[PDB]
Amino acid sequence: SRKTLVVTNDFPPRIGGIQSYLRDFIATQDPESIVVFASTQNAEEAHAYDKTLDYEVIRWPRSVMLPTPTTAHAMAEIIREREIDNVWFGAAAPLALMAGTAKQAGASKVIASTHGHEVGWSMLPGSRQSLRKIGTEVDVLTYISQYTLRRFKSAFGSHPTFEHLPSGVDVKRFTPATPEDKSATRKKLGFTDTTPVIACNSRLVPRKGQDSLIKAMPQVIAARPDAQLLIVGSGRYESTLRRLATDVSQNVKFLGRLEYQDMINTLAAADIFAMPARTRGGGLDVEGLGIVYLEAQACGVPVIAGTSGGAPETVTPATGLVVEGSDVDKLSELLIELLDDPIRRAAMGAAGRAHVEAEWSWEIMGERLTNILQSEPR
């Protein structure tokens, strides 16, 4: 059994996307075969958190872990002391620039994980050269979607083998609602069993397409007068969204940022989950994957996804629909059509749940990581 050291600046108790990614991936592995080397933002909160774990965390007593000689030295010592076989950089740029030292220290395999940022790194000349240096020193480069791969593949070069490793979804916590729970949730919101409910859970920023949803509502409301768009989340774009929703205000609910379990109950009680993501920022503001799509399918709820980035990759023709956010006529048509067909909706949600259980759970994704970390080097 090969032993892995994960080297990261992004680790709990701090809250974030990479933090969740690593935490949930590490928990899929045998805890005796895992050591973490992480920076420390608050010493007493880090110690309190590390004591809840069944695997070792070694804290680097700096607020940010940077690719420096002292950090590489410390990483090297751990590699030899703990007899490390795999070195895993939880985020490729810039920390995986220490991959050379990992090989010098005696590690037989170096893995680096990309997420969203390396797409932006693909554009600048010097930034692109750092991606090349990482690529020459890393044996396995993981990516969240076929879209992100296409964007940065040539920057990294052909030395590493490229492996698909997106986040999974907890299929025991994101689970279809009982008729009891769903009915009670709706009453909590001031709705009934018959209220048409569209849910959008996401940060309130232009690219998520809550603006597109709001502009599609007049037609939906005309067709289904009691239809409700639930906007779950917070963000800078809220005030613009509230202004867009002025004339449809009776049918749009800004629920703000909900507690974790309330967010799951609200989602599971919805008829449709919609988030018509578009690409903005000159091609830089993109949906890398879209975990919310996987969470909706896990709750057995039909999905409307956008054309942005890796968003289409989350759904099948059986489980969800892919739409252009700016196409308001089509988005409205799709929502009304889906709201008027409860048989199709029941079929799409069932297929969505089966889809995540077959391809997107932490059990499935954990098996993929096991394969990467436990296979002999080529």
State the nearest-atom distance from the C-beta of 178 to ligand GDP, in Å: 21
State the nearest-atom distance from the C-beta of 286 to ligand GDP, in Å: 10
Binding segment (CB under 6 A) for ligand GDP, from list 32-40, 196-204, 308-316, 341-349: 196-204
Nearer CB in complex with ligand GDP: 55/254? 254
Binding segment (CB under 6 A) for ligand GDP, from list 68-76, 86-94, 150-158, 291-299: 291-299
Among positions 290, 302, 325, 352, the unique one binding ligand GDP when judged by CB under 6 A: 290
Among positions 202, 228, 251, 265, the unique one binding ligand GDP when judged by CB under 6 A: 202
* Residues binding ligand GDP: number (CB under 6 A): 14
| CB-based burial label for 30 (10 Å; 0-12, 13-18, 19+) | middle
339 is in an annotated binding site: no
Confirm or reject binding of residue 291 to ligand GDP (CB under 6 A): yes
Site for ligand GDP, residues 292 to 331, rule: CB under 6 A: 292, 295
203 is in an annotated binding site: yes
State the nearest-atom distance from the C-beta of 268 to ligand GDP, in Å: 13
Confirm or reject binding of residue 233 to ligand GDP (CB under 6 A): yes
Name the closest residue to ligand GDP (Cβ).
291
Confirm or reject binding of residue 232 to ligand GDP (CB under 6 A): yes
Give Cα separations from 286 to 114, 145, 209, 268, 296 (angstroms). 15, 12, 12, 26, 20
Among positions 16, 17, 283, 377, the unique one binding ligand GDP when judged by CB under 6 A: 17
Among positions 189, 258, 347, 354, the unique one binding ligand GDP when judged by CB under 6 A: 258
CA dist., res. 124 & res. 356, Å (int): 36
- Please, how many CA atoms are within 13 Å of residue 174, restricted to the half-sphere of its CB? 27
Confirm if 132 and 332 have CB atoms less than 8 A apart. Answer: no
State the nearest-atom distance from the C-beta of 232 to ligand GDP, in Å: 5
State the nearest-atom distance from the C-beta of 327 to ligand GDP, in Å: 22
Confirm if 246 and 214 have CB atoms less than 8 A apart. Answer: no
Nearer CB in complex with ligand GDP: 97/199? 199
Nearer CB in complex with ligand GDP: 97/298? 298
Nearest partner of 9 among 53, 60, 80, judged by Cα: 60
Q: Which residues of the chain form contacts with ligand GDP (CB under 6 A)?
A: 17, 201-203, 232-233, 257-258, 260, 263, 290-292, 295
Point out the annotated binding site.
203, 208, 258, 295
Point out the annotated binding site for GDP-alpha-D-mannose.
203, 208, 258, 295
